[PDB]
């Protein structure tokens, strides 16, 4: 299993049905595919989380090209291009 950060439970990690039985919330959807480029993440993709829209996305899809850049903006507070 995994922990769900939304409810704190040990979880099967089922598809989100927050929006409707067929529709994830954008935050849950953003765990599996990038909301910028709409590609499924590949194992080892560098991703970070916007503090506004609560979505994960590719660092490269926000012109963050290194771990160093990703750590610096994530540390101080990351506001993605979509929310700016």
């Amino acid at each position: 299993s995994v922990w769900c950060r939304h409810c704190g439970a040990t979880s099967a990690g089922l598809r989100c049905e927050w929006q409707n039985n067929y529709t994830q919330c954008a935050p849950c959807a953003s765990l599996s595919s990038c909301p910028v480029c709409y590609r499924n993440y590949r194992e080892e993709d560098l991703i970070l989380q916007c503090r506004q829209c609560d979505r994960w996305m590719h660092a490269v899809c926000q012109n963050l090209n290194t771990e160093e850049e990703v750590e610096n903006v994530a540390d101080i507070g990351f506001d993605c291009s979509m929310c700016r």
Binding site: R42, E44, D45, L46, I47, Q49, V70, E71, F78
Partner: peptide, 6 residues
Amino acid sequence: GAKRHR
């Protein structure tokens, strides 16, 4: 706030 997908 930042991870690698696994």
